[PDB]
Amino acid sequence: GPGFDFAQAIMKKNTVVARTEKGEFTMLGVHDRVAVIPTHASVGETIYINDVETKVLDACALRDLTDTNLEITIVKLDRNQKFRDIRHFLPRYEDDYNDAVLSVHTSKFPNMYIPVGQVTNYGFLNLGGTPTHRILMYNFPTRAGQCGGVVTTTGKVIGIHVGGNGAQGFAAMLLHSYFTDTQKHHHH
Amino acid sequence: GPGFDFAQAIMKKNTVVARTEKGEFTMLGVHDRVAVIPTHASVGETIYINDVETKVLDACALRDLTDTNLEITIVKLDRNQKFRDIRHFLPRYEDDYNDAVLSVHTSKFPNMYIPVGQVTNYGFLNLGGTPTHRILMYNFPTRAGQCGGVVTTTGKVIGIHVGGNGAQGFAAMLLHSYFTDTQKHHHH
Ligand SMILES: *[C@@H](CC(=O)OCC)[C@H](C[C@@H]1CCNC1=O)NC(=O)[C@H](Cc1ccccc1)NC(=O)OCc1ccccc1
Ligand SMILES: *[C@@H](CC(=O)OCC)[C@H](C[C@@H]1CCNC1=O)NC(=O)[C@H](Cc1ccccc1)NC(=O)OCc1ccccc1
Prior knowledge:
Two copies of one chain form a homodimer.
Chain A: H1 4-14, E1 15-20, E2 23-31, E3 34-38, E4 46-49, E5 52-63, E6 69-77, E7 97-104, E8 112-127, E9 130-138, E10 150-153, E11 156-164, E12 169-173
The complex binds the ligand *[C@@H](CC(=O)OCC)[C@H](C[C@@H]1CCNC1=O)NC(=O)[C@H](Cc1ccccc1)NC(=O)OCc1ccccc1 (2 copies).
PDB class: hydrolase
Keywords: hydrolase, michael inhibitor
Assembly: dimeric
């Protein structure tokens, strides 16, 4: 059955409530002070984390080599506590999955779990008017208030919720290589 | 940890979406064509069950011997399918419980699970102006849309959600003897 225990352990140690000009989002912390949030949350230079105003030291809105929105923004936060490192739970590659759970952590829903069933590598999505790539789809009627929600199976954190049409929900993929230590250049 | 599997098996086989003049409620089916719903759903002589209009053959608004609201209404429904008999999962007596789950099945939330933690035998509640008895309390900020939601621990179905003040949630108890086959008299 659905990996509720795994979902709950991720929610407990690795989510915070984030709030921007656009409202509240579930926020998954990945390692150190690095977390993710859907790009359309429109992150600025400060953000509320569990109602504490917090400096955004870095924010990268991911796009692929076709210059198309992936709907993931990676943020680095000025806070004291480090997130438990969960990069080993991120999938290496695109894939399809069985029996996933969607978990939400907002002020309205501090702890909620939704089995969304089978998750398919969907690809292209016109996301409320923005072309977007690398989308996962599940047949569940997801709602406003669930963006940022964490999509897991047992042992894998696979995406964060970003959209729905009333019948399906859509998550942006998380891939291991989004977060590898690496060597870089000028990005803003 | 929380008995998510048990909660899910109850939701799968024993809940329907019920809709009255007051809106949608999670509805737990108990045995045969007998189900429960919070009294303030204000059940009439027909009700929608999964959007199918359905005759209410009987509705009993439970009150205790002090003539006080228990907030449970037991209904008998004119439908073809029998509910799986779950009376053996109902507690015999009032009690306190650990690590409970609150499960909701409405159109907006067809399948949602919320760990509400410790559940205490609370007693008297002024429920939005109606004196009410035999209430369970959990420290979780429950919301509109969750009434009727099923409160379980592993192996026990213990109540249905009926109220909250923004910080706590309140469920009406379910006791085994509410549903025993019995011999009766004139009740309307
Ligand atoms: C999540 C964000 C939100 O509600 O707004 C501020 C918190 C929301 C979830 C979505 C709404 C209906 N059902 C759902 O599962 N996502 C969106 O509204 C999304 C735009 C957005 C905004 C902020 C952050 C991330 C994304 N737009 C959307 O879902 O449009 C509907 C759609 C989707 C796919 C195909 C066609 C139409
Ligand atoms: C559930 C019913 C509802 O939303 O209305 C139509 C579907 C709702 C849940 C409650 C609302 C805020 N947080 C919650 O967990 N219950 C009530 O609103 C309840 C009256 C009612 C109506 C229909 C069916 C059952 C019960 N009233 C209520 O909760 O009042 C607030 C309160 C509670 C306890 C002490 C003080 C004040």
